């Protein structure tokens, strides 16, 4: 289920942020969970969320990684932008 | 010996090397209870790849090191397959089987490709079919249609289970 | 025959209970014998009973193994539940 | 020598190491009487695995140590196969055959996989086909369709028998 | 030919009876020869007779082998019973 | 050497180890006369398995030790194949061929599976095709359709013969 | 060892042996970031051959020796495949894999034909599928349709990327 | 893009002329870039330009290599001739 | 070393060992100018076999020893392949390549079968693909369709040329 | 050396070891004149097996020892293939080829199966395709459709001829 | 051709009779030549005649070889019998 | 070109005649050159001429080799006959 995913994502919530040195905002977390499930056929929200997440976690870090201070991951753009980067029409 | 390809995450779980799972408990309860069977201790899984299934495996291993595993298996321990290759190849993979059968103390999880191969076919599959050596497989049916099924005695060896996306 | 099976099961009656530390109740024993033969095509009551049995012997032990006092194996659930766990509509 | 893979349960039966069988008596009577044959002393079994067949074997061995075995075979003794492996492998398995043929006093039961193998094919199968060395096989037909049959002279060597679930 | 078979069976007549310690009765011998040829497709009367024979030679010996005095092999049952044991409707 | 797989029943026939045949005499007369051929000394048989054919073979061997064999072959002697297997396998079977070709004094009967194999194909089949080494095969056509035929030069090596149930 | 077929252009880039690329930076940023993945470090490329892609590869290697490569990979180094052949062939190619896996310090780029071959199939592909050994492929989809895809677990091993003519 | 190609060609501009001992004239360079893209389906302007180029660089060198003084590569013929040598109707 | 299979006709041309060619001059002018390329020094030829092409090759070599070869190549020298074979085989052929790459002074002409082989595939083809070692091939397209093309990077390594019957 | 598989019937014909042929003279005249060709000295035959064709071959050899063979070939001599087999096999068959190519004095007739084999394909076929070593094949088209044809350069190596039953 | 065969058989006429110590009668020789060609599909009259021949040459020798004086090979039976032995309805 | 071939044939003119001990007549030489080019698709006049030639050089030698005095190779038959031997309708 989308929700359990969030929990299992909450499971890895610390994981890749402690890899990516960021602060996950569950708002985002639930967001893509819906959104990916909505927009992504192939991989699975058990992952593809985290996919987006880590990728978002990257994109932030990317910006945060180098020249764009927020360490946390936004809800929206983290989902949105990336997801828009995934597809479009944010 | 019992190394290289032979590895286990149970201690790693007691080492806390991995992630506490959720929700596949009663799912695992099945997977667990598969071992109970004089007929087939050996489950296989269907479902969507990458979803936590090998952690679902680890879920067992946790519940193992948790001793949420009941009696008989409590002594036994996970083995997480290693896949790789190196003259011949499989004989190694063939070889390890007695070793772990010699181990009297463990279990292996076979992972995903349970393979119809060129170089292959029955590899351990008889020693599988030996009616010994508690082990676990997994795939999605798309493969499951073949190896376990095209024999059907490996079907008689394997117990299929699947779980939807949580 | 279903019945001889019971005997041959009675043969292994002590066996896996002395493995599983339980008390087999022939009621169950004959039960699945019919029931499995009824409900299970593939493996053979010479085994599949014991399959159920040991599995039942597990399921009890499972409950009995860890947190659920009866050491004996019930007739019904041992058959039933497990068999329902096998199929349904207990 | 005649050890390791070479082992017997007859003494073990005289040792009472195993279970008194029932009901396959006249079934065994056949399996027994297979040895009588100058043509084929060597039966193979079909049926459902794990049902007591290798004890059905032992049933013979009991009836052997029982001396329910009639004359010729009474001197002869069970051998229960051991399966395992270790450079080459089978030559051992090849080797033991003269030993037991040298034994002038026994019989072996070949167990289940009577194998079409990669490394194989005719192994003892000629010395089988030598028209000597009383032995017994078993399987379910699903295998039986091949090795004994695809030769058909091993069919001419083997006598198939099957018994339903009791 | 069925008949030559009998002769070739007569060839092995002494053979497996001296293995099975019995007395072959050519009545039986010709009997299955017809009968097997009638009833058995697969193996060949050059053998399958002897098959039946030795098997009959067993079945007698079986009875004769252990608890059921005739050492000879009957015509009928040796064929018949066994052949009925082969098929039915003796 | 010329042992293990290399064996003969001729002496065994002079030893009386086996059964006087009947009726395939002129049948054998052919099989006999096959050896006469500079082209193909080497017959193969078709027919129904288990019917006496390898004794029909022995029939030759009797008629050999009987010296019902005429001149050229009288020195030559049966070899009855042994089939079995043991690293590589066939090279042995490959090896023996020069030995018997070195023997200057014998003949072998290849028995039934004249094989299209995985590990195979041309094995002796060239040394067969060497146009030397008098030998005999047999099968039923169902196989005969392939190996001797699919080459057709082994057809050019082999002479097919069949005889009905007596 | 780690030579012959094993070679690297990174030092060569530090040697300035090759051409400063342009424009595939963020393209490489992806290709780069592929390595980040516990799931798939291993990208493959689609596109038009001969366009600079293996220099696009080198682009990484520059950005590697540039240390435009971020942390984890900075120690690791390009390997540019060498293709050629010489009894067996691939076992060498099979062999090198542990060596570089032993290297604890590098990465290889597999180049174009990632091959469905006669002599083949799974070669490293299991050791690929071993879930280790960061590597990169490339092709145009026309091939991509098969090997990575027909498994789909190599799809689960490979990450496809493509870039248009600049 | 055709233009980036020119740059990447400008990248190898020194390269094969220092192999072919000639002077590349960007006029040509941009020329084929359009022209090849126009006229050549198969190989890619990232190369096929340079293909033409080096080939032009040859053709000049060819002439320049042996008996036909300009070391530089013309715009036109270098493109044109060769490209006409590629196709026709210069 | 640089002998046996390694041989040259240039000196032989200076030795006058061979025939002054005609007419393929500007044809060779191309073949010549192929070497000029940082991209592909390495031409291959299509056309009708036996027509003078390897002398067309020699035509270069003449024009080489003629010093009709312009600058860069003037130091370099023909190598005319030798084809033959002898445990492994190709490793030799593999071996010579560094030698001539070590030669800093030559060129080889690969002749006709540029081979898709059983024992093969990439042999020097990576060291070919190494982007070094000026060499020349030839065939008729019927072969050309495959090896150079089925890679297409060897197409990216090779420059095809053909000339009609004079 | 040039023995074992290497053998000749020409001397045997001068020895009179064989049969004077008839009627295939002008037929042979062709087969003869095949050798004349710088292009293909090497004929192959189609027709009905066992009809005298290898004697038709010998017919040449007679006409050879008859010196009905005209000039160039008069020194050259028949070789009649020997087919047989024995680790590897063909390398021998591969080996002999230089020997006879070293012979500067002979010709071989390849006989019937000119083979598409498992272990094979190009064997001498390149050294065949070497454009040297005058040799002769034969078959019926049913085979001819493949090996000589599926290459077509062996078709370019072989000249097919057939003759009806006399 | 059937006839040339006879000649080529006449070629081996002395051959296998000097092997089989018999006297070939061309009557037979031409006979099977027709007859085999008529009755035998598989092997070829260039041989199969001689096949029959040598086999006939055997069958005679067979009779002549051992207890059945004619050393010559008859036309008919040599063809016929053997050919009838080949098929039937002499 | 057909003509250059003649020259290149003239190149090997001495060659195979000094192999075949004959005298090449360029009349023939040019002849097949046209003629083969006309009549032969597969091999190439650079060879196939010489093919014909050497073959003609054989056919003459053949005749000249053994019983059929001219050592030279005719124009016509050398082409013609052989070429007719190649095809027909001389």
From Swiss-Prot, chains B, D, F, G, I, J:
GO terms for cellular component: cytoplasm. ATP binds at residues 47-54. Keywords: ATP-binding, Chaperone, Nucleotide-binding, Repeat, Stress response. Residues 2-166 are annotated as: I. One of its GO terms (molecular function) is ATP binding. GO terms for biological process: cellular response to heat. It comes from the Bacteria. Required for growth at high temperatures, probably by acting as a chaperone during heat shock and targeting heat-denatured proteins for degradation by ClpP. Belongs to the ClpA/ClpB family. ClpC subfamily. This is ATP-dependent Clp protease ATP-binding subunit ClpC. It comes from Staphylococcus aureus (strain bovine RF122 / ET3-1).
């Amino acid at each position: 289920s989308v929700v359990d995913t969030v929990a299992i994502l909450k499971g890895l919530r610390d994981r890749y942020e402690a890899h990516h040195r960021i602060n996950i905002s569950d708002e985002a977390i639930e967001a893509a969970v819906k959104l990916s499930n909505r927009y992504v056929s192939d991989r699975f929200l058990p992952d593809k969320a985290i996919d987006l997440i880590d990728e978002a976690s990257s994109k932030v870090r990317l910006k945060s990684h180098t020249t764009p201070g927020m360490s946390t991951s936004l809800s929206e753009e983290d989902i949105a932008e990336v997801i828009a980067g995934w597809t479009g029409i944010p | 010996t019992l190394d290289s390809l032979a590895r286990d995450l149970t201690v790693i779980a007691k080492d806390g090397t991995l992630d506490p799972v959720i929700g596949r408990d009663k799912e695992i309860t099945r997977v667990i209870e598969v071992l109970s069977r004089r007929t087939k201790n050996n489950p296989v899984l269907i479902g969507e790849p990458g979803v936590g299934k090998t952690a679902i495996a680890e879920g067992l291993a946790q519940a193992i090191v948790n001793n949420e595993v009941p009696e008989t298996l409590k002594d036994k321990r996970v083995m997480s397959l290693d896949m790789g290759t190196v003259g011949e190849f499989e004989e190694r993979l063939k070889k390890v089987m007695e070793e772990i059968q010699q181990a009297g103390n463990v279990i292996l999880f076979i992972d995903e490709l349970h393979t119809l191969v060129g170089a292959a076919s029955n590899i351990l599959k008889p020693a599988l079919a030996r009616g010994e050596l508690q082990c676990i497989g997994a795939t999605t049916l798309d493969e499951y249609r073949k190896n376990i099924e095209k024999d059907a005695a490996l079907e008689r060896r394997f117990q299929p289970v699947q779980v939807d996306e949580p």
